């Protein structure tokens, strides 16, 4: 209240903020205790929402994730203080405004998202809600940042039987069997994301389409990029590429640096 000046709302509950300390732009996320499904313990065994546990674990220094700067407990809620780049726009609004992205730009963005998801995995965190809505663009730096770990979990190599993520980005094995593994599920969602970037919208709206495993390109997409998307969207999890095989794919070579991407595509 006194440590930060609260501004107006952004999206639903996240508000614009300024840190009184040094006038740093922040985002102030409120989470209702009554609406929290999954709880964790901190390294000092304090009972907090899983979101805070996952945010603390990924808040190393690699800035492909929106870092948690601070948090507060209140009687009926938790307040998360997150970094706020300015100017910013989420990748969903960016794609709506600009339509199907050029392959060069899609390569830069998809690469940065891959580096951010690998970072999460390296820190033992599975995001479980990778989509254009959960990616912020710093328009000056040309840096993408992952947000909203509220559907996340600790990474494990054993099967998941729960999911609170976006259904249209969820894989066939979830729709059919209520069963998935983190990595192969994440690769599926990244297939949806890449299609979404180069085609201007997600390929599937209905369960029938998700489990169908037919990918129709509504926009001109190179054969190399079509192959990567088809491979990520393989029906059988074991047939999906590893993060290694994605980043070694011919389509992913000669990526633009963030600043190159800002200069050429965002300025």
């Amino acid at each position: 209240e006194s440590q930060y000046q609260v501004g107006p709302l952004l999206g639903s509950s996240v508000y614009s903020g300024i840190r009184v300390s040094d006038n740093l732009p922040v985002a102030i996320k409120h989470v209702e205790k009554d609406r929290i499904s999954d709880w964790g313990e901190l390294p000092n065994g304090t009972r907090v929402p899983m979101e805070v546990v996952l945010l603390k674990k990924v808040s190393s220094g690699f800035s492909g994730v929106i870092r948690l700067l601070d948090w507060f407990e209140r009687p009926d809620s938790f307040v998360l203080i997150l970094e706020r780049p300015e100017p910013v726009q989420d990748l969903f609004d960016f794609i709506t405004e600009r339509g199907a992205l050029q392959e060069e730009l899609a390569r830069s963005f998809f690469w940065q998202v891959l580096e951010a998801v690998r970072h999460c995995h390296n820190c033992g965190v599975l995001h479980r809600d990778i989509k254009d809505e959960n990616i912020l663009i710093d328009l000056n730096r040309g840096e993408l940042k992952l947000i909203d770990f509220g559907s996340g979990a600790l990474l494990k190599d054993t099967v998941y039987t729960d999911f609170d993520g976006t259904r249209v980005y969820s894989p066939p094995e979830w729709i059919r069997y209520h069963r998935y593994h983190g990595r192969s599920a994440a690769v599926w969602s990244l297939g949806i994301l890449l299609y979404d970037m180069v085609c201007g919208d997600i390929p599937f709206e209905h369960d029938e389409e998700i489990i169908g495993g037919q990918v129709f390109f509504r926009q001109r997409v190179s054969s190399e990029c079509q192959h990567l998307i088809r491979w990520c969207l393989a029906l059988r999890p074991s047939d999906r590429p590893t993060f290694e095989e994605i980043q070694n794919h011919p389509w992913m070579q000669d990526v633009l640096l963030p600043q190159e991407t800002a200069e050429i595509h965002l300025h």
């Binding site: 969903f92 709506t96 559907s151 993520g165 976006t166 259904r167 249209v168 919208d201």
Partner: peptide
């Protein structure tokens, strides 16, 4: 088609 957000 109609492009839209999808909730979590």
């Amino acid at each position: 088609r109609k492009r839209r957000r999808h909730p979590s």
